[PDB]
Design a protein around this nucleic acid. Structure first.
Ligand code: CL
Ligand code: CL
Ligand code: CL
Ligand code: CL
Ligand code: MN
Ligand code: MN
Ligand code: MN
Ligand code: MN
Ligand code: MN
Ligand code: MN
Ligand code: MN
Ligand code: MN
Ligand code: MN
Ligand code: MN
Ligand code: MN
Ligand code: MN
Ligand code: MN
Ligand code: MN
Ligand code: MN
Ligand code: MN
Ligand code: MN
Ligand code: MN
Ligand code: MN
Ligand code: MN
Ligand code: MN
Ligand code: MN
Ligand code: MN
Ligand code: MN
Ligand code: MN
Ligand code: MN
Ligand code: MN
Ligand code: MN
Ligand code: MN
Ligand code: MN
Ligand code: MN
Ligand code: MN
Ligand code: MN
Lengths: 79, 97, 103, 95, 94, 105, 99, 86
DNA sequence: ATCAATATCCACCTGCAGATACTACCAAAAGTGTATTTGGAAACTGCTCCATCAAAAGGCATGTTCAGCTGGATTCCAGCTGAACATGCCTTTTGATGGAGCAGTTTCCAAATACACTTTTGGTAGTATCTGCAGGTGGATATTGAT
DNA sequence: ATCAATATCCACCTGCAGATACTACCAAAAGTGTATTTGGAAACTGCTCCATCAAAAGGCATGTTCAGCTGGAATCCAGCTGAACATGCCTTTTGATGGAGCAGTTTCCAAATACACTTTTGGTAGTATCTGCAGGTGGATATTGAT
């Protein structure tokens, strides 16, 4: 599967950057679900901006505008 | 043989990854995940390179902060091990659930 | 130039133009673009000053994203102003809950 | 033929040389500063816009920008910004 | 000076869905501000949409996209359908 | 002469909506269809909350919708609850809800 | 041998009672004095429309109630049924109001 | 000719009142230190909203804080309020 | 306390990706002047509703007593999760190549703006008149808690 | 279960704050027709940069083992926090007023908008050059962890 491509090691690295020392075996599956929901909400809005502009290519701007409306403003990609 | 105690290497990793800024999820697997999800909203979509990078930068920053809050929830329950109930608690209180 | 009259490095003329096209209000006073350009300049200086310091503290002469992150997050007021903002490639501040330390 | 795309990069660069003459800035970091300026511009112009509408006014003056600043910037940052803003208008008016 | 509100209209719709139900002055005030709020959100999103695509006109199309961006799942599907229907009926007049 | 609302088959005021879109300065121009579409969306959302609110009032043996009924309608409907997640309905109170671990025996 | 409900029974009765009603739970005049005191420290000589004070109170009560729900969840997460300052603080930190 | 000095009014938010709010919030048991923590939290909440409301009042050159000033202040703080206009 | 095993840090180097430099061209942005058009400030002042005061009195805050049962401290140990390694699978690089489709132009018409009139209509007002339901009774029924 | 002290429920009833009704008025709002202006949909198309393939290279994710030490179960008990009570204070209610100050209606001037014309830039391109610092090495010494 694709979501399974988000590996246990990477998920642990992210947690480490987050200050986490000990991780439960069940965290890995919980994180994938969280990451999937996050992307669906952001990608759904991006594609919507893409469809609006009559394009077949999702642009960095489409993502930046989607993130902004989701209240997760991002700097460094055309913001 | 030489063996570090459980936890000692974790502390090292934390120091190591909190100092760096590189993305921690391999790019191709992530780019595949992104494309399949988008495919459910509109087919035959192309993505600018920067477009996928913005999504990874945003997702990782989101997951990293979520783990910070998850860590506080676990520590709140007098633990040092994060569990699903910790992530749920953090999301619930954030207003995501 | 309107900027030089105001003693600013930021483009007064451009700021003024941006306000009109933005449809922020039917009309835009003359002082408004000046005051705003001045505010934007000041906030810019504030950040470059702290990021410049973050770069020198790291024995570097060139300001990169990480320095901007450290500048902003280590400053109570800037951190608040940008509390819902993600600086790409900025990482996080070194920070470990004391209960996770050795012994 | 490529359409001109404005940015605050040259103006940001100028301000960088006044505060740190010997330090530079990567393009990616410059893009972030540009995102920062545009963001604050929009936040301030937005509050200014609303202020004018709440007061049945059709003109955005320096008073709207000023009040907008007090509402958006936290404490000290607002005190100084208001200071810089006023300084720039008085110096602009008497010139 | 006259202050406009959506009250008479909210009342018409109420009588349509519940012919025998009234509405308190306070509830009506809640409804008027709910309508004003959604209007602002949709108009704002449409505004941004037009700017992002360098268009100086807000058309039914911008409103539609604003609606898909703003409302969740089903509310959008139904709002969208009710909206296009009303536009189609409007253009088939005169 | 007839109203743009009747032409669109709507209860909500198309003329007012079109006028409010102009005064707001959301763009320089406003197409004829925009106020029609917006008026219809607003009419629909209004109908949806009044439907649910009227029912809550009926469940409480009341014929007059009050704030509390609007709150019950909103909080009990997943989508409206989300559309209004950052909104506070005065005199709405809260949904009866007690955590299990707090119940006796 | 008077009748005594057990600890917790009346608390549960109160929860049901208060979750069923919509009236303001803080006395009005006292709340209004607090608003006037705080406002006065920011600016002297201010008057308040009575509905302005009521709006502040509805907002404050909605805010506190919701915060207590979250705090309650923070206590239960710790295997307690007694909310404590540390729960309010955990809730405010996660909500992004504190450090 | 002159008013009375206002002070310590935060104690007007009594222990019984805080208990009730906690009750509406689903709370069954309350620690003794909750009451001062709550007053503190409310004071901060009030100062932030009132600070904005008054800023709108002064911008319009009025001496009377209106329900609208409060509503706009709550709105910009992301705590939209329905019921008092706007 | 001693001693071996890694991890961590500093000094010195180099290649090179990414930042500078200069020159060049130019559509669009700014600025200067001249006219015309107005928002909204200054006055005056109608009259809304906010601050205050009096009084009455009963709902609800205070401060206590008493003891139930919850939180916090200990003790234990079963078992999950971290650390270390052998494996080899598939991400990373990059270089090249179609070529999809984004983005720059030019054309041109359905649709929007701008104005003048004429017809309605939603918001206020001034008076009058119903009504849904809050709040108080009273008596039957459902809970809770001691035995 | 038994049974008593209380809370909860629900039919009934009444007073009235709040919701409806009506008639008038009318400034603002809308609809109607024309005339004039153009935003941006279309149709092409130049070339930017996205998707594939190839093909090693080996970096890093897997699957195992082993056991350190963490989470969660059991117990115990001091005292914190709820339930109930006696008091009587201060918030709630009801009215009554003065007048601060919000808000409506004009009059009128410092500015803002509107156009024309001239000058100045900020971007976009090309081509040539320079330079901060990532990525390595070597050797020193800190930090861990077993005895
Ligand atoms: Cl869990
Ligand atoms: Cl001005
Ligand atoms: Cl349209
Ligand atoms: Cl605590
Ligand atoms: Mn004071
Ligand atoms: Mn040694
Ligand atoms: Mn050393
Ligand atoms: Mn050395
Ligand atoms: Mn005028
Ligand atoms: Mn009384
Ligand atoms: Mn007393
Ligand atoms: Mn005891
Ligand atoms: Mn216990
Ligand atoms: Mn066990
Ligand atoms: Mn090893
Ligand atoms: Mn093609
Ligand atoms: Mn195109
Ligand atoms: Mn009428
Ligand atoms: Mn009743
Ligand atoms: Mn009775
Ligand atoms: Mn009966
Ligand atoms: Mn009554
Ligand atoms: Mn009548
Ligand atoms: Mn054109
Ligand atoms: Mn064509
Ligand atoms: Mn294997
Ligand atoms: Mn063992
Ligand atoms: Mn333990
Ligand atoms: Mn276990
Ligand atoms: Mn104790
Ligand atoms: Mn009793
Ligand atoms: Mn006066
Ligand atoms: Mn005058
Ligand atoms: Mn130049
Ligand atoms: Mn050269
Ligand atoms: Mn290095
Ligand atoms: Mn070495």
């Amino acid at each position: 599967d694709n979501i399974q491509g988000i590996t246990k090691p990477a998920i642990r690295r992210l947690a480490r950057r987050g200050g986490v020392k000990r991780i439960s075996g069940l965290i890995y599956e919980e994180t994938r679900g969280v990451l999937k929901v996050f992307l669906e909400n952001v990608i759904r809005d991006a594609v919507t901006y893409t469809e609006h502009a009559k394009r077949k290519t999702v642009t960095a701007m489409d993502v930046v505008y989607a993130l902004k409306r989701q209240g997760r403003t991002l700097y460094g990609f055309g913001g | 043989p030489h063996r570090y105690r459980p936890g000692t290497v974790a502390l090292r990793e934390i120091r190591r990854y909190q100092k760096s800024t590189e993305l921690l999820i391999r790019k191709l697997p992530f780019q595949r995940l992104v494309r399949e999800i988008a495919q459910d909203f509109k087919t035959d979509l192309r993505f600018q390179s920067s477009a996928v990078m913005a999504l990874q930068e945003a997702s990782e920053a989101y997951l990293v902060a979520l783990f910070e809050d998850t860590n506080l929830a676990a520590i709140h329950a007098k633990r040092v091990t994060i569990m699903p109930k910790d992530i749920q608690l953090a999301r619930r209180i954030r207003g995501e659930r | 130039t309107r900027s030089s009259r105001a003693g600013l490095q930021f483009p007064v003329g451009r700021v003024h133009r941006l306000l009109r096209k933005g449809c922020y209000a039917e009309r835009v006073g003359a002082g408004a673009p000046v005051y705003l350009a001045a505010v934007l300049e000041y906030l810019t200086a504030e950040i470059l000053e702290l990021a410049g310091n973050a770069a020198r503290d790291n024995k570097k002469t060139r300001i990169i994203p990480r320095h901007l992150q450290l500048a902003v997050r280590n400053d109570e007021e800037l951190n608040k102003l940008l509390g819902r903002v993600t600086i790409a490639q900025g990482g996080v501040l070194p920070n470990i809950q004391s209960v996770l330390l050795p012994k | 033929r490529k359409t001109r795309k404005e940015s605050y990069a040259i103006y940001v660069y100028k301000v960088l040389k006044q505060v740190h003459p010997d330090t530079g800035i990567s393009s990616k970091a410059m893009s972030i500063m540009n995102s920062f300026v545009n963001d604050v511009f929009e936040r301030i112009a937005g509050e200014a816009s609303r202020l004018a509408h709440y007061n049945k006014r059709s003109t955005i003056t320096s008073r709207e920008i000023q009040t907008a600043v007090r509402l958006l910037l936290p404490g000290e940052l607002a005190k100084h910004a208001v200071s810089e803003g006023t300084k720039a208008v008085t110096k602009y008016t008497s010139a």
